[PDB]
Amino acid sequence: GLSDGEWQQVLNVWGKVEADIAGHGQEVLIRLFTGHPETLEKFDKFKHLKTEAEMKASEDLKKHGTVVLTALGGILKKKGHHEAELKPLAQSHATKHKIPIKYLEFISDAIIHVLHSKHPGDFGADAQGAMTKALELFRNDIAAKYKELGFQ
């Protein structure tokens, strides 16, 4: 449950991401994969990436980063009214990709890390609070769908 002012902060922060969705998406995934190498194993199409240099050079990783952040941005712009947008992602990530909710926590924190890394001094405490709450809401609603599906 975010206030109007918190959603305003979220969407203000998101404008930073939308200016360079592929660069943000790439860095989010690289942060996820390098911080939590087990997550790489969930991607048949990225498990060949042995080094961060290879990850950085991967155009397909940037492409997927764009897909991920485009989806997330579409969800965030719903300001919590995202059941229709979230449902297929929860279902695909539980049933097809088999992504534990822990990895969604990892990527949520990776987003925060990337925002500070790319916008140092420009991702204020209020913005971090609002973005964190929005990612918690996202993760929590996914978690509810995971529970429905019995997925761990």
Least distance in angstroms from the C-beta of 6 to ligand HEM: 18
Site for ligand HEM in 53-112 (CB under 6 A): 67-68, 71-72, 89, 92-93, 97, 99, 103-104, 107
Is 36 labelled a binding residue? no
Q: Which of 16, 42, 78, 82 binds ligand HEM (CB under 6 A)?
A: 42
Least distance in angstroms from the C-beta of 117 to ligand HEM: 17
Nearer to ligand HEM, 9 or 39 (CB): 39
Least distance in angstroms from the C-beta of 63 to ligand HEM: 9
DSSP string across the chain: ---HHHHHHHHHHHHHHHHTHHHHHHHHHHHHHHH-HHHHTT-TTTTT--SHHHHHH-HHHHHHHHHHHHHHHHHHTTTT--HHHHHHHHHIIIIIS---HHHHHHHHHHHHHHHHHHSTTSS-HHHHHHHHHHHHHHHHHHHHHHHHHT--
Nearer to ligand HEM, 5 or 98 (CB): 98
Residue nearest to ligand HEM (CB): 92
CA angle 146, 151, 152 (to 5 degrees): 110
Nearer to ligand HEM, 10 or 89 (CB): 89
The amino acid at 86: L
Q: Which residues contact ligand HEM (rule: CB under 6 A)?
A: 39, 42-45, 67-68, 71-72, 89, 92-93, 97, 99, 103-104, 107
